[PDB]
Amino acid sequence: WALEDFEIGRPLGKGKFGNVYLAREKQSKFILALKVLFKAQLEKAGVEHQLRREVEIQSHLRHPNILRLYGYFHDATRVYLILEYAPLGTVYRELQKLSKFDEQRTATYITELANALSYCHSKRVIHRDIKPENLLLGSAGELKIADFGWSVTLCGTLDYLPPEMIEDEKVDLWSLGVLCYEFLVGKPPFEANTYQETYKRISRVEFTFPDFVTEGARDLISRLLKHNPSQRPMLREVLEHPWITANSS
Numbered sequence: 735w736a737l738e739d740f741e742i743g744r745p746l747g748k749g750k751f752g753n754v755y756l757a758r759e760k761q762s763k764f765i766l767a768l769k770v771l772f773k774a775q776l777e778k779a780g781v782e783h784q785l786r787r788e789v790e791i792q793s794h795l796r797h798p799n800i801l802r803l804y805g806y807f808h809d810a811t812r813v814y815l816i817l818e819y820a821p822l823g824t825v826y827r828e829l830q831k832l833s834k835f836d837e838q839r840t841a842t843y844i845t846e847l848a849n850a851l852s853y854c855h856s857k858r859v860i861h862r863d864i865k866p867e868n869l870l871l872g873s874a875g876e877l878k879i880a881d882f883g884w885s886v887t888l889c890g891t892l893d894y895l896p897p898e899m900i901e902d903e904k905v906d907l908w909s910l911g912v913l914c915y916e917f918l919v920g921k922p923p924f925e926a927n928t929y930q931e932t933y934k935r936i937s938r939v940e941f942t943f944p945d946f947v948t949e950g951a952r953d954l955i956s957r958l959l960k961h962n963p964s965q966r967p968m969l970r971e972v973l974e975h976p977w978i979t980a981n982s983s
């Protein structure tokens with residue numbers, strides 16, 4: 735595999751170590767995303783080896799709710815990732831657009847996430863925290879885990895981190911509790927006015943439900959948002975929760 739086998743289109747966005755463009759596979763007239771990661775920039779964040787690890791993993795991850803990594807290849811000073819193309823953009827955007835999602839869009843989104851996360855839990859693969867900014871939408875309005883945080887400082891991250899990460903397969907579940915809450919309200923559960931404050935809310939697990947938050951919705955975010963990972967439900971539970979099955983699909 736090489737750069738010549740692709741026709742490059744318009745740039746799609748910038749990353750921590752490079753740009754990402756929409757491209758077409760010459761031999762198949764196939765559309766996709768070409769992500770360019772500059773080796774040097776990588777060598778600087780002590781990720782040059784880690785990245786190699788994730789790419790390895792994500793390359794064996796085939797699931798409708800996970801950004802498909804078709805292939806990858808390197809050269810002189812940069813690295814390439816043949817990525818699936820999500821046409822509807824990010825979930826963060828669609829949310830920065832509709833202010834808040836309705837009970838059904840919410841429930842469905844959590845399901846897709848729960849499913850993909852399961853597919854990985856079943857392959858000795860786990861995920862870190864999850865942000866809306868890292869969720870893309872497919873042609874069918876389907877969510878796609880697109881960050882590359884798989885496993886077998888930092889801005890705008892604290893609000894999505896769980897207790898243990900500021901004080902294993904349980905972080906994801908905290909993420910769902912946080913993603914579910916935001917999805918419904920419009921802002922994360924422990925967002926405050928200052929850094930210190932935020933920290934204290936996440937740490938003491940201090941959050942409140944706005945008037946309109948259905949009660950079934952309140953049972954799940956609460957069972958997920960446990961300071962003790964041990965009590966955070968299994969994905970099987972989330973997937974079978976009364977309110978999920980009720981408004982999801």
Ligand SMILES: CO[C@@H](C(=O)N1Cc2[nH]nc(NC(=O)c3ccc(N4CCN(C)CC4)cc3)c2C1)c1ccccc1
Binds near residue numbers: 822827868870880
């Ligand atoms: C930095 O890496 C990229 C990356 O690897 N990727 C891989 C991959 N595949 N497809 C992508 N599509 C888009 O980024 C995109 C953005 C806006 C867009 N429009 C705006 C809103 N409209 C309503 C519809 C059309 C349509 C598609 C990406 C990004 C990344 C960016 C954001 C989240 C996750 C990953």
